[PDB]
Amino acid sequence: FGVKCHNTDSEPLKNEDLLKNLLTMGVDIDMARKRQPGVFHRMITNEQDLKMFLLSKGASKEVIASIISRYPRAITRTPENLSKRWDLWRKIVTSDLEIVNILERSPESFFRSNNNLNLENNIKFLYSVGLTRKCLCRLLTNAPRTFSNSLDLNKQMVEFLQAAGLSLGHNDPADFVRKIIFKNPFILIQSTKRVKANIEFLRSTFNLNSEELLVLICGPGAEILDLSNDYARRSYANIKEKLFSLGCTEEEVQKFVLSYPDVIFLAEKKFNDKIDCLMEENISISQIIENPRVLDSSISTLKSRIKELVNAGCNLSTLNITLLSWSKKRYEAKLKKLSRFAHH
DNA sequence: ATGGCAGAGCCCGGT
DNA sequence: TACCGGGCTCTGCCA
DNA sequence: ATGGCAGAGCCCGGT
DNA sequence: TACCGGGCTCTGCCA
């Protein structure tokens, strides 16, 4: 500055004209403005060029507008910047098409940042962690936000997971980490706060030794680290109480969960109802806890399966109820073999 | 999960 | 020259 | 015989 | 959440 002022007089509004039009010629303008209002109060939008870019990568005009719908801000970013970022993805992705499939799945990922520097940092950091192009690909598809993450953030998660494995005397923490990321691609987009808590859950809940704990966290209990605040704690408490209500043991319950931790992902009501319905048909509580995977089956199949079995002149306290959580093929297979067998 | 949300900072234009 | 602050953007957190 | 073989079930990972 | 099924394992049978 250094000269003078403005206008001071009732002035006509001046908006980005081409915007509204070009958009409607493809996109759901209503939804966008719901999500990213400020984009529309913006002038000089690079919407136009954007389209041609995506088009050059072989993207259906349909899906293109679908992307702007859920993430209006895509318009904001220049084609020259997008080109590099795209190429960075190419490292791990190998294919222009997969990137497309991932964008039409979660647009945020690619567009929530223009920082390609940091994006390069992230990629070369994740390789330095010992990851195969195959694995980073796994990450990129499932948890694309991971690379939109600040390098400091990603570095913090890793350092945390290392310190953790380390603190249990893991002879190779960076590898401990490697395993987790394989069993749980969405690990890098979770707060250390969350994970730390969820780990402390596993710790106190189960009474294992350092080694058993380590193996768990890598193995079956990896997914448990994504769980929401106090969800795991609640979900388990529910299980514990239901089983305890049936005369079980603190240690009986632990094995049951540890032998099949996916039970935590069941809705508290889904679980209770499944157990109750098995109980209804006089199926020993012990039969269940020693065949936890029978709780895979929807109560619907689980129920009919039973009735079918019973009617086929069978004895549910005698038989091997793994049958219930079997393929429609394999189940029907043993069923006839049985109805025929009990048919003598 | 991805979409919503909020705290912090930046762009930018106005005295 | 200095100083203000509106409003978008960015990053990370939640479920 | 013990090694080959087959029917049945389980581990486990992939949608 | 539900559901599938590939392929190893287990048990028992044969000569």
- Domain extent for A180: 1-344
PDB experimental method: X-ray
d(CA A56, CA A50): 10
Chain A 239-268 residues in 7 Å CB range of strand E: 265-266
> Distance of CA A254 to CAs A24, A249, A271, Å?
57, 8, 16
Domains identified in chain A, total number: 1
Instruction: List residues with CB under 7 Å of strand B.
Output: A 1, 5-8, 34-35, 70-71, 105-108, 142-143, 145, 186, 189-190, 226, 228
Nucleotide nearest to A192 (CA to C1'): C13
Inter-residue contact A93 to A137 (CB < 8 Å): yes
The single-letter DSSP state of residue A264 is: G
Decide: CB of A340 under 7 A of nucleic strand E: no
Helices (H) and strands (E) in chain A, counts: 21, 0
Amino acid symbol at A188: L
Inter-residue contact A231 to A200 (CB < 8 Å): no
With b for 16 or more beta-carbon neighbours within 10 A and e for fewer, the A194-223 pattern comes to ebebbbebbeebbeeeeeebbebbbebbbb
d(CA A21, CA A19): 5
- Burial class of residue A164 in the structure, from the number of CB atoms within 10 Å of its CB (0-12 exposed, 13-18 middle, 19+ buried): buried
Inter-residue contact A225 to A192 (CB < 8 Å): no
Inter-residue contact A189 to A145 (CB < 8 Å): yes
d(CA A100, CA A96): 7
* Token pair of A184 as six digits: 């749980």
Give every CB contact of residue A236 below 8 A, 6+ residues apart in sequence.
A201, A205, A257, A264
The 10 Å Cβ neighbour count of residue A259 is 14
| CA closest to B15 C1', residue | A5
- CA A110 / C1′ C7 distance in Å: 24
